Amino acid sequence: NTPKDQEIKKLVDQNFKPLLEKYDVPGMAVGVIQNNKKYEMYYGLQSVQDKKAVNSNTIFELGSVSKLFTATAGGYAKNKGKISFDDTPGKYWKELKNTPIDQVNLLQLATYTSGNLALQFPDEVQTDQQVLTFFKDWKPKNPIGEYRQYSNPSIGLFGKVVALSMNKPFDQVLEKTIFPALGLKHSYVNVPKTQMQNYAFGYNQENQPIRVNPGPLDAPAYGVKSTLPDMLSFIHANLNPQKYPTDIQRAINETHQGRYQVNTMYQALGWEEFSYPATLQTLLDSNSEQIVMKPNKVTAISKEPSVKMYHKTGSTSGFGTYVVFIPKENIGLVMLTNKRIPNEERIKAAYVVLNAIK
Ligand SMILES: *[B]([O])([O])[C]([C]N1[C]=C(C([O])=O)N=N1)[N]C(=O)[C]C1=[C][C]=[C]S1
Numbered sequence: 257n258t259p260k261d262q263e264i265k266k267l268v269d270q271n272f273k274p275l276l277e278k279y280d281v282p283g284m285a286v287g288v289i290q291n292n293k294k295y296e297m298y299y300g301l302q303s304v305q306d307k308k309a310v311n312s313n314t315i316f317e318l319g320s321v322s323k324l325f326t327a328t329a330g331g332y333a334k335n336k337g338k339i340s341f342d343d344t345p346g347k348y349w350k351e352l353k354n355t356p357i358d359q360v361n362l363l364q365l366a367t368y369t370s371g372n373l374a375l376q377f378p379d380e381v382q383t384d385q386q387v388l389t390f391f392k393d394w395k396p397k398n399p400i401g402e403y404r405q406y407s408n409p410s411i412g413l414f415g416k417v418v419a420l421s422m423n424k425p426f427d428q429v430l431e432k433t434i435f436p437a438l439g440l441k442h443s444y445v446n447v448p449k450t451q452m453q454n455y456a457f458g459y460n461q462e463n464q465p466i467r468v469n470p471g472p473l474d475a476p477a478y479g480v481k482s483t484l485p486d487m488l489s490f491i492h493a494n495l496n497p498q499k500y501p502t503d504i505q506r507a508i509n510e511t512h513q514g515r516y517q518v519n520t521m522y523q524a525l526g527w528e529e530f531s532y533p534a535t536l537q538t539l540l541d542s543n544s545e546q547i548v549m550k551p552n553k554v555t556a557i558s559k560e561p562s563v564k565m566y567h568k569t570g571s572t573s574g575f576g577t578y579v580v581f582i583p584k585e586n587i588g589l590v591m592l593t594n595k596r597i598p599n600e601e602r603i604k605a606a607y608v609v610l611n612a613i614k
Contacts, residue, residue, distance in 0.1 A: 264288050264295045267612050271605040272591065276300060281595040282459055283310040285484040289495070290587045290613065294488050302456035302594065305465065315447060315455045315481045316592040317468050321570030321577040322480035324490075324511070325443075326415045327526030329422075329434050330366060331510030332503060338421040341366075345391075345413060348420040357394045357413075364401050366414040367515050367523050369554065371398030373410040381472045390472075398551065404518060405551040408477035415476020426475050437504040438493050443482040445475045455481065458574015459595040466574045478572060484592060491581050491588035494566070512566065516554040518547060523554070527568055531561040532582055536607050543569055543599040567603070571596045578602035582610065 283300040298310045346358035360370045419426035427445035457465035497508040514522035521542045522529035570577035576596045581588030
C-alpha cells in the first residue's frame, strides 16, 4: 500500500526539498521520529568546494536550538538540588553578590525577563573578564519578571551559573554529563580535530562558506553542533522522558513546564509551547519580529492546556535549525541546513509534513 518510510520521504520531498532550489541552500538534513521509528533524509552538500555529501555523520551548527541543551542542564542541576530557580546569580558567581543583577532570579534569566538585557552582548565584550564587568555594571530598566526580551546574555548567564553549581565549565557540563545522559554520541560544544572532516561549512547570503565566530557565553546561547541521528535521539528523549534514568528524565520534564504566556505562546525552559492542536498561524506568530526582537509584557498562564506541542528555531550566520515535537501523536521532526532560510518556511514545511503523516 506504500511503505511508511517511502510515504515520509515523499512528504519531505514535497515540502522541504523545494526550499533548496528556492533559497539556494547547499545541504539539508530532515528527520522524523514516529512511535520510536526514525526516518532520516539527506540532501545536497556539507561542503560545496570538497563535493562532500550531507549524510548521517554531518555535524551542523544548531544556533539557538543550543538553548534547549542549556535548559536541560538547568533542569538537571535543579532536580539534583544544586540550584533552585528562585536563587540569584550572586549565590554562585560570587563577584555578582549584592550587585543589581543579583536582584534577578535564575528562572527570570533563563526565560528572558530581567527587564534590561538585549539580544546580543555589545560587540566589545569578549573575554571572561569583560563578561564579568558587563554584569557587575548592569542596572535595571523595566520591572523585573514582567517583560520578555529574547536574549543571549540572559540565558548565557543562566548557563554559566548552572555550570558553576556543578563545578565544571559549561562545555564539560554538556560534553561529560548531559550529552552522555541523553545518549548522544556526536554532539559538541567544541568539535575535536578528529571530527572536523564531518563539520559542514555554513553558507552566508552570498553562498560564501563560513563557520560560527567565538563569542561571550556563546556555548549556552548558540554554540552546540550535532548530527541528524543525535537530534532525533534528543527528540526521542523529549517524547519519552520516562524511558530515561531519573536525573535526566526529571530534567527533560522540567524543560516542558510553561512559565508564562505571550498570547498563544507559552514560554517553557528553552522550548516554546503551545496548546495542541495548534494552527499554523499560532506557530508562525511565535517567530514574528515583534516577539523575537522587541520586549513584550508577559501574562500569567490562565489556561493550562491538557495537551501541548513544542518547538524551537535556531540560526547561526551560516546554518538554520528547527525542532518540533507533539507528545500526543508520539511524533517529532528535525531540520538542519547549512544556510539560513526564513523561519516561516521551516515552520510551515514541518507543519504540513507532520499533519499529513498517516
Ligand atoms: B537564536 O538562533 O534564536 C539566536 C538569535 N538570532 C539572531 C539572529 C540574527 O541576528 O539574524 N538569528 N537568530 N541566534 C544567534 O544569536 C546566533 C547568531 C548570531 C548572528 C547571526 S545568528
